[PDB]
C-alpha cells in the first residue's frame, strides 16, 4: 500500500483505489495502473521533473529503503493477475530489487523528488509506474 500526496491530489495504484478515490476521481489510466483523486487537505510531496535513472524506493515487505538503477518509462508486457488481463503496461520502469504483493504504492525518489510508485514485481524485479510526465499534478 501507499500513495503520493501533492497539492489537492492523491496518486494511488489504480488496482488499489478505494470507493472514496473513485467518488473524487480526477484521472485514471488502466494501461498505467494509476488513479488520481482530489483531497481536501494540502499535500506536501514534491514531484521530480527530471530524467534520473537512479533513486531509492521503499519496500514494505522488508521495512527498508533500497537504492536502484531503473529503465526509462516504457511499454512492458505484464502477465494476467486478478486485477488485469495480460497486457502491455505503459510508462513502467524496471529495476532489479525485491518486490512482492503488498509492496505496491511504495515511493521511488531521486534527489529532485518523487519519481513514481511500485506497481509490479516478482523474480527479483521491481516495476515502478512513472508520474514525472504528469505536469498538471503541480498546478
Ligand atoms: N501493475 C499490475 O498489473 C500489477 C497488479 C498486481 C499484480 N501484479 C504483479 O506484478 C504482482 C505479481 C503477480 C501476482 C499474481 C499474478 F497472478 C500475477 C503477478 C506484484 C506486484 C507488486 C510487487 C510484486 C509483485 C501486476
Ligand atoms: Zn531526478
Curated annotation (Swiss-Prot):
Zn(2+) 1 binds at residues 50, 52, 110, 112. The active site is at 15 (for protease 2a activity), 33 (for protease 2a activity), 104 (for protease 2a activity). It catalyses: Selective cleavage of Tyr-|-Gly bond in the picornavirus polyprotein. Homodimer. Cysteine protease that cleaves viral polyprotein and specific host proteins. It is responsible for the autocatalytic cleavage between the P1 and P2 regions, which is the first cleavage occurring in the polyprotein. Also cleaves the host translation initiation factor EIF4G1, in order to shut down the capped cellular mRNA translation. Inhibits the host nucleus-cytoplasm protein and RNA trafficking by cleaving host members of the nuclear pores. Counteracts stress granule formation probably by antagonizing its assembly or promoting its dissassembly. This is Protease 2A. It comes from Coxsackievirus A16 (strain G-10). The chain holds residues 869 to 1007 of 2193 of the full protein.
Amino acid at each position: 500500500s501507499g500513495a503520493i500526496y501533492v497539492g489537492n491530489y492523491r496518486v494511488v495504484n489504480r488496482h488499489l483505489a478505494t470507493h472514496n478515490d473513485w467518488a473524487n476521481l480526477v484521472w485514471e489510466d488502466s494501461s498505467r495502473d494509476l488513479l488520481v483523486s482530489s483531497t481536501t487537505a494540502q499535500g506536501c510531496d514534491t514531484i521530480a521533473r527530471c530524467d534520473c535513472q537512479t533513486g531509492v524506493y521503499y519496500c514494505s515487505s522488508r521495512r527498508k529503503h533500497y537504492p536502484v538503477s531503473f529503465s526509462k518509462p516504457s511499454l512492458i508486457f505484464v502477465e494476467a493477475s486478478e486485477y488485469y488481463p495480460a497486457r502491455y503496461q505503459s510508462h513502467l520502469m524496471l529495476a532489479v530489487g525485491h518486490s512482492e504483493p503488498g509492496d505496491c504504492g511504495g515511493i521511488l525518489r531521486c534527489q529532485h523528488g518523487v519519481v513514481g510508485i511500485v506497481s509490479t514485481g516478482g523474480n527479483g524485479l521491481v516495476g515502478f509506474a512513472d508520474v514525472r510526465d504528469l505536469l498538471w499534478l503541480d498546478e
